[model samples]
Target chain A: EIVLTQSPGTLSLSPGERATLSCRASQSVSSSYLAWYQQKPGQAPRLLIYGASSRATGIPDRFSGSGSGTDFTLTISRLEPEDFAVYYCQQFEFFGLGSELEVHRTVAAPSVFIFPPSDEQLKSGTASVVCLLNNFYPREAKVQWKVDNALQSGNSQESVTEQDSKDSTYSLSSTLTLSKADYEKHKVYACEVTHQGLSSPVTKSFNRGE
Target chain B: QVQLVQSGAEVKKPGASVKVSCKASGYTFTGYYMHWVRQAPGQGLEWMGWINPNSGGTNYAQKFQGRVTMTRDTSISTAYMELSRLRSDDTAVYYCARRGSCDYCGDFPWQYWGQGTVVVVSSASTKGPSVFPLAPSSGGTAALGCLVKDYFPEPVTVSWNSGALTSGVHTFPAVLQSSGLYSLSSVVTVPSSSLGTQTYICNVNHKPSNTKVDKKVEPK
Candidate 1:
């Protein structure tokens, strides 16, 4: 139960520039208990960063938060037009003051990759295909897989979305395994990626010949 | 059961003033400090200032000087901020928050808050802004202050330039004035090494009129 104060009132920047925001608790606060939020006009507040530096699910990689004790900083790597909204930092579930940002730029899309299984592995009863989505901004994304046009259920394992160090984009990998008989019967596998950046889910299929 | 309930909304003409109230309950009010905050329409929250109900003393951010006054009534457990010279830019929501602390709890100070009081300063009012550097307080070390005053439109950005320092920076909240303008202050400890020729800068940016005020300081 402490007073949290965020400063600078507002941030004004152009597209492609960085925006640095600050939040100060009246007293020391643990990094584990801090969360940052982004609020756009007419929309509810969205949790963008949590536990200080960890980006929340589906949040753009560019939105990074860091700091401990009574001071915290949220840095948006590159300003996009949509980022002009308000940003808030809260401690222990309560929001103090917030900082505002004004910017301009277009949202970016995700890059999809589906790793192929080796022929030897494919010949075995058990084989796996890895679906990797990379270089996407605005971390909100979904990765789904299908076998021979059928949706995959219990056979797929997906990792938590992560950010790339090179450009602050996001990437995640999902692996789908199949039994030998089913693997042979189903000649084609597909990985579908859904993100707001795209008009619809983007799918890439892998055929046995390829 | 601790709670903070604030006053209702008010509509005022230019050059007028209004007093908003925040009543606290469920805890010992004098045991903690009360903080005032501001939020303009479609904008983020700004730290206005805080009142020490026990001591009757107040600390403010550099930009809220003169325009905002904070007072408290120990018997009633109510805190108040008097805003003056209402202008269109002064239209916004104001809040009073209570610090959450215990005998030995080490955490953020404010954990409770009042809903908010809506203040709309009517149009046809003029407004402006200002900044100044205060002398550093001397003890074993020095604490310097940057004060920014009377900016309308309810929101402004204040930042300190990176200079000689070893300790953490301290920013007091801003205080709203009787005229609906704002005053605030921020403090930084001056390193002994930075004594003779140190330059600390305070940058205040107000977007409505595209105004940026920078104030420089030299430790005495």
Candidate 2:
């Protein structure tokens, strides 16, 4: 088993600053299959980078990762207030102890906006409705969807949270595709956003007629 | 026309959605099953899932479960896939294929496929190419390898510093990986005398990122 060690057990920085985190492996890392994740208070971890330097989906241009052999790096070119949280680097499915970004910032709860089914797509009797969630500190915010009050399938993507730039909160989005039959079968669809900041999850709904 | 025709390539933003279709013809649609596959640059084909035309029953690979929506339009004889919350990982060519029984032979699956629809989920990431020596320096006469990977947009030019001798050199195709990157391997063969007597620089030029990587090797 190869061992991965993370540095600077704790890092303190201000928003809009740069944060560089390192993960060193005890032995050479093959194919450089290392990934990085971000975890905030009481929220699930979010994948930031994969394949060493390849940014995962929804990662901002500011987030860059690179490394070869035994040395790996996760660089946040410019940090946001919301960026201050717990960061972890992993390899071979084995994880590091974690590098805590003590941003000395603060947050919880999320907001959402649900777009109506696409008019262009309706020409083919099918359409896609999109949902966006923002103003949340925890990128790991939990989200769910429902059609006519029953759980429905929605593909969700999370965004990084940066701060002090007045964007201290994180963002996320989900997309649900529907067929013409769906409109005739159901009248309402809802996106439910949940996080520790909010006492209750926020429900944003889209109507078929809209 | 008893063939499968697929949808055109699609360009989409990350976190968006796309629908790829494969239209079937000249056969009983419900009698067969349709499968879905994803091929990223330099990657092996990944089976996404399959749907039954007869009953519309479906099953997805563990990696694709909840990430893909498969449906068949019996009236139209079309197999469709709806992928949402698109990401860089979803960027690839999606092919809809079928299984059939041959005379005296068992079943040949996924042999017949839709030409494939390209899905480009954009995130604006480009990596420069890196060249490395291929292993097993054994049997030192005709040699194989110099792996060029960890790059994107898949265009790499290879040249030997020893200069213009085109014969006995073979170059392979670029493959896409699940990581949304491209990779390729090369094979170089030359005279026995040149093997150890002369040292040459192997160069890999990746134009996309405007970076050149080369390494000198004196094969043993």
Candidate 3:
């Protein structure tokens, strides 16, 4: 069985940059025995390049790989948005099992959950709106508030950002204080979260009396 | 009929033994290899090992050896895994999959997977997270990392404080180890100018235990 080792512990690169991911084998491997895979956050790793350089079915032209014997390389000519993911090199000898040491590129969007104000607070003419952002990576995320189609400014407090220790991901809660008169007057209150990992912000809106 | 039907969830006591079943259907059971997979709650997938139902040959991840036994019944087209001396870390979702082709020589990616058997080991002990101060880069940057390991019902979160510098913070996805426990590491890099002499806090939150651990690091 040939042992494969992946290098550079992690790859932190931006789009349009060239990335060369390497996989070195303990022993010589035939051209047919090498393959590379790309694993996205929480998804199965997909075969990107196999057979020592042949692109897998449906893979783009930008992903090309090549090597012989104990050395192999998977190269991305120009990184795309989705190109930021963990890459693994596998040699077919050990049933395609390779080194666990992989270069991880992070990607994940925040999951939003809202805790509307209580009925008592609504009736009392003051309420606190809570928006929770969970299961997001890259830690750099922003939460914005909006009411009745207009953006809300100030009067908001954010908690100390917490992370899921298991995945090294983040979560946080934001509270917006408002009077029941304003809350009831507005048809909808929306919490929008933006992260570098997402192409668009995730917005969760709460309507009154729901 | 190429499917894997697995047993339902199980709640067991520590030191108890549990045998999970995976029944294959629709295809020749002996033609492909059956591999077992595992995932703790909110954790990444782990490859337990593979078994050849035809020859009764089995291979296990080093950590699973001696603790897990794989067997098959060709007559019923099913595979079984018996886990002994259960611990809190033993609680996880176990899955069985059929190898696509050439069980021994070919790539072992799963083509079909069982729904997964959920195992809950009650009265189990869990360890807290560990933090490490990584060697600073020669380029005048402070770096720190944290590791969380050997917890059951896998779910954890790690964050940096002292208002962690957002850029250059790299958090790795949690990886499942062979011992059925999950482990994760995270690193934060900041220029010396920004790091200053402030205290950097690494906070790890484990959901299963509903506990958090914070470690303070003073940059060298």
Candidate 4:
């Protein structure tokens, strides 16, 4: 568990302006397990960098690096305005392989924050129950929606970034809409995010009955 | 088949501190994140923090939020963890490790780790390397330290291009913490010619992307 600290508060560079967002480790990392992530509004965290300096599979070339050891650097040759967001660094250290002792350690897959729902949003049959899980680690993740303790079906999507920039976090989301008859029941609808690492999944319940 | 092997024991006293190292020998060191973790003398493992050897992005555990600082030596496939304001509680065995999917270690579990280094905290005894004292007076003499963390207790040379002879000297050993991480610094007295230069470059010659860092001191 390495402690990572970011610097420069916010990179307020204009479009086309070059900028460097800094993340400092509180301790030296041995394995190349270090990773970087981008936080943007209305979307799950995007993988920007991974390992020491490698970029995620689809990351743009505009991002680059130079230096090593007690001192390292992550440089964006040219900052694209769309790249405006908070960046983070993480290292995976749950357990190991070829070891006889089995450890029940769970790595929370990465998550994104959907902008807070609108106040005017109506609670009706057409309305959907979608929970945007935030700050998740990486592993096999699944989402389930429950209404009044009963199970409901939903749709999900998943994507991953390249490893070149050391941003190896994962991103995903799920959505569920109710029918006229189901909405009339006026019961609570909950979003449950479960993964392989958990003996019991984490659930966030919302009361639509109100 | 890159692997990390670290050094053995270190003893220090109250008011004094220690550094540890993690040496990499095998695959490219730069392309991966060489990370560090901490464990107390008799406690479960905790995430003290991790450093991105590429961008130097650092994250620390809320528990050890203060007590420690980490850095890297890209040229030598090493990382450094320095414990300041040393106290008796700082005594422990430290280990360095890598955190990714290893071809040899299957899925990533912080698989590759160096042998633990034991550091004892007490009153100061024999000074290890005096040539490189901690924090020499600025504008007087500055020791450009190169510390590789989570590796063994090996020694590396410190070279300077400050218009003076580029030479290096090792200092005494510092007591390591319970994090299982090791660190060492090679210090060189800054030369007069570098007085006006805005930046001084320190390079670690390990592998993959050889890391070279340029630092500048702000005058008071």
Taking the tens digit of each residue's C-alpha lDDT, what string does model 3 give over A76-160? 8776655666666655324323222222337877656565565434554666666665557775678889986788887675543
Scored by TM-score, the top model is 3
Q: After superposition, how far is residue A24 of candidate 3 from its true place, in Å?
A: 2.5
Ranking by TM-score: 3, 1, 2, 4
- On the 0 to 100 scale, the lDDT of residue A92 in model 2 is 39
For A113-199, candidate 4 gives per-residue lDDT tens digits of: 221112222332234333444334443467776667877653322222211122223334344545556565766767677765456
**Candidate 2 vs 4: which has more TM-score:** 2
lDDT over C-alpha atoms for residue A67 of model 1: 90
Candidate 2 residues A128-149, lDDT tens each? 5555554566455766778889
Off by over 4 Å in 4: A1-210, B102-108, B124-220
The lowest-lDDT stretch of 10 consecutive residues in candidate 3 chain A is: A95-104
Docking class of 1: incorrect
Cα lDDT tens digits, model 2, B42-82, are: 34345677788899898887777787789889899898899
RMSD of each: 27.1, 25.8, 17.4, 28.8
Model 1, residue B163: distance off in Å is 61
True-structure Cα RMSD, model 4:
28.8
Q: What tens-digit string does per-residue lDDT give for candidate 1 at A111-189?
A: 5655455444444355556665555666667887888887888766554332333344554556666766767777888
Question: lDDT at B18 for candidate 4?
Answer: 74
Off by over 4 Å in 3: A1-3, A13-19, A26-31, A47-51, A54-63, A76-84, A92-210, B1-11, B38-47, B88-93, B101-220
Native RMSD of candidate 2 (Å): 25.8
